[PDB]
Structures are given as structure tokens and as C-alpha cells.
Design a protein around this ligand. Structure first.
Ligand SMILES: Nc1ncnc2c1ncn2[C@@H]1O[C@H](COP(=O)(O)OP(=O)(O)OP(=O)(O)O)[C@@H](O)[C@H]1O
Ligand SMILES: Nc1ncnc2c1ncn2[C@@H]1O[C@H](COP(=O)(O)OP(=O)(O)OP(=O)(O)O)[C@@H](O)[C@H]1O
Ligand SMILES: Nc1ncnc2c1ncn2[C@@H]1O[C@H](COP(=O)(O)OP(=O)(O)OP(=O)(O)O)[C@@H](O)[C@H]1O
Ligand SMILES: Nc1ccn([C@@H]2O[C@H](COP(=O)(O)OP(=O)(O)OP(=O)(O)O)[C@@H](O)[C@H]2O)c(=O)n1
Ligand SMILES: Nc1ccn([C@@H]2O[C@H](COP(=O)(O)OP(=O)(O)OP(=O)(O)O)[C@@H](O)[C@H]2O)c(=O)n1
Ligand SMILES: Nc1ccn([C@@H]2O[C@H](COP(=O)(O)OP(=O)(O)OP(=O)(O)O)[C@@H](O)[C@H]2O)c(=O)n1
Ligand SMILES: Nc1ccn([C@@H]2O[C@H](COP(=O)(O)OP(=O)(O)OP(=O)(O)O)[C@@H](O)[C@H]2O)c(=O)n1
Lengths: 247, 247, 99, 247
């Protein structure tokens, strides 16, 4: 017969806090998801998002061509854009009718879920023919870029990790792959013989999503926010939901 | 104060040789790339290339449909070619307006980087419905075809490995997957528990490339040569760059 | 755009006229009408894009060395061709020669 | 320490009134704009507006063809409408598939800013081949129509001047030019030798605007009102902002 918010017998309050805490902790458990998003920003203000969600580890790999703006059900200068690709793969190799394709991304943001271990993040940012570092012979196949990731924070809680980089120059023509491993502070190796086949199955079970939104507003409103995803906008504003020990 | 090319004090010469040797050896190290290319040759003289570059191991897998010629931004007889597929998947199963689709590859060449171990190469050359050997029940899922690979050589150095096969007959309608493992003469298993999650990450981090060139000339000039890739042309001519102990 | 004349010379263009037009190619003409409506008044259009890549990213004005730079005048208006927010408070030009 | 709206020490009030008065008076000064709009009303309810804003004097001149409805990015019966023009320029001179083109304006409204001197307004309302009065040989090139202009009033202030005329008959096929001169109650002639080159420059510097709105509602809401322009609607309702000595 106690009054709300006045004693330790407010079970609605306690259960609300536990409900949120359990979600925070489940995601961070070995049973939980790790997620990555790649955002490609185009000059027309639209944004391509690619997302993958999987247990244990997760990544995305795209070609130069795949990262170019594609407007579903509209004209895309498809023939001229084939010629653009040829001239990007080798200088003067194409016969395009344009100096700069507005379909090329102007910037990339990579975001991981807070369940990633940031020291496991690896990126292969290749040239337009998918070579990590000038020539295959001298290429390490990735860079460990975790130190560059900024914490996306809401109410003091890390809700995600962001690496943002611009591609403002004519020569910024890239292929891109990124990968991170789910946190595991235990000494149980999820890829040790006991569980390695489950990790192989996780590669099959990973769910992917891709869509082009017309505006960052639409991305924030209809993609980030409804799904309780983390995001950092072009104005450096953080989005996400803090859950640990919170009502 | 020594004269160029006349003593052991030609440091420009020594460093040039070391620079090239280091690239050769880095590629062959466990830190290095292994690469595969699949070339599909069409009757119009164009060539589809698919390339993947990754640490540890690498492969490509394509469907029958995926290997058919696609001309970006041009007509492709898309409806008739759906009917072609139906008649290829089962005899008399389609209603195509042609006896032979000129979109079917006439030949395939598989090339691996010299950092592959040739004894690890495996190929699954399936029928048009993606069965390795007539029926699933009697199929081994691959053949180890390394003994068939020819050494692509420049100046006495192996710059790559090639398996070329023609598809000259109406019945040569294939699905195709190929895989090789990076050399590892050490007794350190890159997939042992210590490193297995890095191999899982390598699957995410692998970069892919695909493009159709109008001619083998254009492939040699604008794809093989600029990237210091190995190649064997239809005239049996070898392309590539020898690097070990060379200026 | 170039004009050559004796005594004095100038050029005057609308917002629409300065947008990229690709002769003999597709130009998203309908969507670009909607772009214009949304540029003339906020939320006034129904365009399928946030930013039209047809909008100029920069302008350079060049005069021949036979101009008197102290006579140069520019009317850089908004998208509805008003020099300075509202007609009632607009001087119809700025003397920009010092720049 | 006085209370708002209770003394001569309400400086916010005084400055608000001066701010508005200054805008009213600046526009009417020789440094200010004079503006003209031509509205062409089509049977589908859409309205073409042409506006020009310039110092000293201002006008608009359009051909018969230019005043016809054009729907950007939609079909316009362009070939048939060429034939319509031929049959309008000379009776039975075309081969059109229609008796009356719905692209012809049904009415015209000319509006000047209140900074015009109404006695300077001149109109050349020509026939479809751009002759003011039947034949060039007997044409005065304009009519001084200022006496016909109605004052558009808001709160007792003239906010603009309107001349409205319908074109309800099949034979109302017009070319149209209008011109007015900015008020100048001084004895300083803005076109006297001292300033004549500035008037020549004003011809270059005049800004033009044209757009077709789908409805008079849209014109009122999104063109007239946001820009503090004067307007008189088909219901004889006046729009505009009174500024002289007003808060
Ligand atoms: N890897 C992690 N994952 C999730 N939460 C963490 C992690 N590391 C620390 N935290 C918790 O998140 C909160 C924020 O810690 P953090 O160190 O990020 O804050 P800070 O020191 O103010 O900012 P910064 O470290 O970026 O300068 C702390 O309450 C901490 O306990
Ligand atoms: N697996 C390998 N990878 C890279 N280089 C190798 C490999 N095996 C041998 N080599 C080196 O490459 C060079 C060529 O050796 P190879 O045995 O291919 O020549 P060959 O005997 O003339 O030709 P083949 O063996 O094809 O008849 C030698 O100098 C050798 O040391
Ligand atoms: N040419 C003008 N430009 C701007 N304001 C004017 C002009 N002539 C008069 N006014 C002012 O505008 C207000 C309206 O004057 P106006 O003579 O138009 O009113 P009215 O006599 O009620 O109407 P009308 O003259 O149309 O019958 C007056 O306060 C007057 O001082
Ligand atoms: N560098 C070149 C050379 C030729 N063309 C020709 O011009 C036409 C333009 O078409 P395309 O580039 O395909 O643009 P759209 O057809 O407008 O767009 P989409 O194909 O995406 O519908 C093509 O058919 C092609 O034959 C071209 O666009 N660019
Ligand atoms: N076996 C058949 C049966 C019918 N058609 C019809 O003929 C048309 C030919 O078009 P398609 O095969 O699609 O070739 P294109 O339109 O020229 O090429 P693309 O679709 O690649 O632009 C099709 O619309 C289809 O309705 C056909 O091509 N083949
Ligand atoms: N905001 C909107 C609403 C509708 N549409 C419709 O989608 C089609 C796209 O055509 P358009 O914008 O005119 O582009 P293109 O036809 O490709 O280019 P152009 O007209 O310059 O040849 C139009 O017919 C129009 O009916 C559109 O583009 N944009
Ligand atoms: N008096 C005539 C004679 C012939 N045609 C023919 O019929 C077609 C109708 O097209 P048009 O009048 O141009 O109308 P749309 O093509 O529908 O509109 P737009 O051209 O503005 O897209 C034309 O190609 C023209 O050859 C016509 O319209 N009117």
C-alpha cells in the first residue's frame, strides 16, 4: 500500500530499470548482437545505409560501384555511369560526359553498436579497383582504426561508436570493407573448437539491410530513431537510447 | 664519392632491389594478400573479370546467371534471356527465341596470385542449377585442380597461376566457385584458436571487384598492367611483374 | 554567359536560368520544377531530393580590363529575385568593385 | 523605468514604427525599387506570374507564344500548339486539332508597386503578331492606361496598383508589354546627363522572375504573402502590407 516513487516498494520502478538494464546487458553478452552500419552521403543530400547484424562478429564489404548512388525507379545515367567507372578504374579509360559523377559518395560514416570491442575494428579502405594499398604486393589487408572511433553518448552512456571521414577530393574513389568483433571479456574463445561451427553458422544467419533515404532528416526520423539505433549527425549531434541502470 | 653501378656503395641500387624484394616477400607472408580472378570470355570479345583479394584464403562463387554477359546501360534481351535460363535449367523448359545465347561464356580462366598454395586450390564447377556432379547425392563439393594450373612466368619468376578451360559446346552451361589458401610453410595454423576470429574477420574484409571490358586489349592495358597483376592471354603470352631480387 | 558591348555591359539571370541544363540529356525536368517551388518558399514543393545538384556551387564574375572597376554593380538577389529580403528595403545593387 | 505602451519612453514602439516607415519611404525614394507583375490566368486555374524589379523604371514585354500556359515537365501538345499559333497569326493558317487552345490566357492582371508614378504607366497590348494597333503604320506604340489602375489598399494605405482585364472571347489573342517609371516628385531628372549611365546600368541590373503556380491559392500563399507583395484576387480582395507610420 505504498505511494509511487517514495519507497523501495515501487516495483513498477524497479522492474522498469531492470527491463532496460537487461536489454543493455543482453546485447553485451555472448548471446547478443553486434551491429555495423555504413552511411554513404551523396551531394544531393541523400544517404545510403548498409547495416549488418550478427552474433560474434560482423562486417560489410562493398565495391566502388556498389557505393555509388542508385535511385530506385528513376533514371541513373546508367550508360554514362559505366563510362564513369571505366575512367575511375584507369585515368582516361572511359568516355563519360561528365567530369565528376554526383553519384560518388562525398563522405562515409561507420557506426558500430556499443557491443563491439573497439580494439577489434578493422577497415579495408581500398582504391576503386579494390586494392587496399596501391598494389596488392605491398598491401596489408586492413588497418585497425579503433583509436579513431568517437563515442556516441546519450546521458553519459556510450550508445555506439563512430568513424566519420569525408571524401571531398576528385581522387577519393574508394572500395570499402569494415569488420568488428563482439565484446568478449571472458577467457572463453567463441571460435575455439567447441563453438567454431556456431560462428560459421552466424555468418549464414547475419541479417543485412540496405536503403537510400532522401535526407538525413528522414534517416534520423524513420531509420535511426524508431529502431533505437545510435547515430551522429553532420551537426555533431548524438542520437541513441541509454539503457544501463535507467528508467 | 663512388660512381653509380661500379661498387657496393651504390645504395640507390641496393635499396631498389630491396624495395622490390620486400614487396615480393610481404605478399607471401602471413600478413599478405592472396588473390583470385575469374575471367569469363564472351563471343563478342568482351571479358567479365571478377576479383577478390583477402588475407589467409580467398574465393569467388557465381551462379550460371551471374556469369552471363551483361552490358551495363545497353539492351540485354532481358526477357528472352529469362526464357534462355529456363531452357538451360531443364531441356525444353523455356520459350526463348534463340538456339544459343551469345551471353554464355565461351571460356573461363582462373588466375591466382603467386601467394596462393597451389595444392590448396579447389574448384566447384557445377551444372546450370548449381550441382557439382549431376546430382547432389553423389557430389563431392569440389575438385582439387592445382595440378592443372600453369605457372605464369616473367623473367624466370612465377607471377601467378592459371587454369584455362574452354566452353565450346552447347552443353557447357556452368555455375562456378573457386577457392585457394595463402601459402603457409610455417607450423602456425592461421585458423587455430589463437587467430581463428581474424580469419572470420578476413571474410568480412575481403575486397571484391567486377567489371566487363570490351576487349582483351582493354583488359591487358587498363586492368592487368596498371595494377601489376598477372595474366595469360589467348595467345599464351604472360603478363606480370617479377620482383624477387630484381631492380 | 558572356556579353560584349560598347559603353556599358551587363548580364541578368533568374535562379532557374542559372541551374545546370544538360542539352539533349535528361534533366529531371518535372522534379526540378518541384525543386524550384521548394526553393521559392520553404516546403512549397514536392521534390524527390534534398539538394539539387543543378544548383551552382560557385560564381565567378569577370570583366574585361576596359571596364572601370568603380562602376561595377551587382544585384545578387534571393531565389524570387529580390535584392535584399524584401523589395521595400532593397537598394537595387551593391557596388562591389573593391572586391 | 516606464511601462510599455503608457508613455513617450516606449522606445521599442517608436523604433517599430520608424522601422516600418523607413521601409515605406525607402522604396519611394530615388534609391528604391519599382516593380511590375504580369499575371496570366489560365482556364485550368493556374497562374503564370512574371515579375521585374528595378531602379528608376521597369517593364515587361512578352510575345503571344510566351504568355501561353507551359507546364514544366509535363506534356504540352507542343506540335499541335505550333499549329495553334499558325492559326492564330493568320485565320485558317494552321492545321490544329482544336478550336480553342486552353493554353491561351483567360485574363491578365498588371500590378505595379506603390513606388510607381501611375501617370507614367504605359501599355502596348498588341495582336498575336505583336502589332499594337491593327497595322504598324497607324500604331501609336503604347497607351497611357494609368487612369484605369485601381488602388490596392490595406488599412487605408495604397500598397499597389492593379489593372485587370479579361480575355473571354476567341479573338482575344494578345502580345503584351507594360512599363512604369518610379515616382520622382523632385526636379532632379534621373535620366539627365549626370545620372543617365546609371539608368542604363539599371536596365542590366533589373531582376526578373517567372513561375507558374497551380492555383491562385498557391500564388497568394507562397508568392504574394511571403514576399509582402500587393495583390488583388478574383474575389476583389486586397493583399499587401501597410507600412507608413504603422507598427
Ligand atoms: N567499453 C565500454 N563499453 C560500454 N561502457 C563503457 C566502456 N568503457 C567505459 N564505459 C562506461 O561508460 C561511461 C562513460 O565512460 P567514458 O570513459 O567513455 O567517459 P569519459 O571519461 O567522460 O569520456 P572519454 O573517455 O570519452 O573522455 C562510464 O560510466 C563507464 O563505466
Ligand atoms: N611455390 C613457389 N612460389 C614461388 N616461387 C617458387 C615456387 N617454387 C619455386 N619457385 C622459384 O621460382 C623459380 C622457378 O622455378 P620452377 O621450378 O617453376 O622453374 P622450372 O623448373 O624452369 O619450370 P617448371 O617447374 O614449371 O618446369 C625458381 O627460381 C624457384 O626457386
Ligand atoms: N500617389 C500616392 N502614393 C502613396 N500614397 C498616397 C498617394 N496619394 C495619396 N496617398 C495617401 O494614401 C492615403 C489614401 O488616399 P486616397 O486618396 O487613395 O484615399 P481615398 O480618397 O479614400 O480613395 P480614392 O482616392 O481611391 O477615392 C491618404 O492618406 C494619402 O495621403
Ligand atoms: N558517354 C556516353 C556515351 C553515350 N551515351 C548514350 O546516351 C544515352 C543516355 O542514356 P543513359 O546514360 O543510360 O541515361 P538514362 O537512359 O537517362 O538513364 P538510365 O539508363 O539509368 O535510365 C545512352 O543510351 C547512351 O547510348 C551516354 O549516355 N554516355
Ligand atoms: N521468348 C520471348 C517471348 C516474348 N518476348 C517479348 O519481346 C520483347 C523483347 O524484349 P526483351 O527480350 O526484354 O529485349 P529488350 O527489351 O530489347 O532488352 P532489355 O529488356 O534488356 O532492355 C519483350 O518485352 C517480351 O515481351 C521476348 O523477347 N522473348
Ligand atoms: N516530385 C516528383 C513527382 C513526380 N515525378 C514523376 O516522375 C517522372 C520523372 O520524370 P522527370 O522528373 O521529368 O525526369 P526525366 O523524365 O528523367 O528527365 P527529363 O524530363 O528532363 O527528360 C515525371 O514524369 C513525373 O511525372 C517526379 O519526377 N518528381
Ligand atoms: N495538328 C497536329 C498534327 C499532327 N500531330 C501529331 O500528333 C503528335 C501529338 O504530339 P504533340 O502535339 O507534340 O503532343 P505531346 O507529344 O503529347 O506533347 P509534348 O510534345 O508537349 O510532349 C505529334 O507528334 C504530331 O506528329 C499533332 O499533334 N497535331
Amino acid at each position: 500500500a505504498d505511494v509511487a516513487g517514495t519507497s523501495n516498494r515501487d516495483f513498477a520502478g524497479r522492474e522498469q530499470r531492470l527491463f532496460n538494464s537487461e536489454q543493455y546487458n543482453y546485447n553485451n553478452s555472448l548471446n547478443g548482437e553486434v551491429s555495423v552500419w555504413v552511411y554513404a552521403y551523396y551531394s544531393d543530400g541523400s544517404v545510403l545505409v548498409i547495416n549488418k547484424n550478427s552474433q560474434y562478429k560482423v562486417g560489410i564489404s562493398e565495391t566502388f560501384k556498389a557505393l555509388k548512388e542508385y535511385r530506385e525507379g528513376q533514371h541513373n545515367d546508367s550508360y554514362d555511369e559505366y563510362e564513369v567507372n571505366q575512367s575511375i578504374y584507369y585515368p582516361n579509360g572511359g568516355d563519360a560526359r561528365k567530369f565528376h559523377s554526383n553519384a560518388k559518395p562525398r563522405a562515409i560514416q561507420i557506426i558500430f553498436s556499443p557491443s563491439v570491442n573497439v580494439r577489434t575494428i578493422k577497415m579495408a579502405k581500398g582504391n576503386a579497383v579494390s586494392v587496399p594499398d596501391e598494389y596488392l604486393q605491398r598491401s596489408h589487408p586492413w588497418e585497425a582504426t579503433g583509436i579513431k572511433y568517437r563515442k556516441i553518448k546519450r546521458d553519459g552512456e556510450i550508445v555506439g561508436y563512430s568513424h566519420y571521414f569525408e571524401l571531398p577530393h576528385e581522387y577519393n574513389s574508394i572500395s570499402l570493407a569494415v569488420s568488428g568483433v563482439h565484446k568478449n571479456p571472458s577467457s572463453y574463445n567463441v571460435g575455439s573448437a567447441h563453438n567454431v561451427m556456431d560462428v560459421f553458422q552466424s555468418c549464414d544467419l547475419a541479417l543485412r539491410f540496405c536503403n537510400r533515404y532522401w535526407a538525413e532528416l528522414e534517416l534520423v526520423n524513420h531509420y535511426i530513431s524508431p529502431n533505437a539505433y545510435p547515430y551522429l549527425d553532420i551537426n555533431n549531434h548524438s542520437y541513441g537510447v541509454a539503457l544501463s541502470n535507467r528508467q
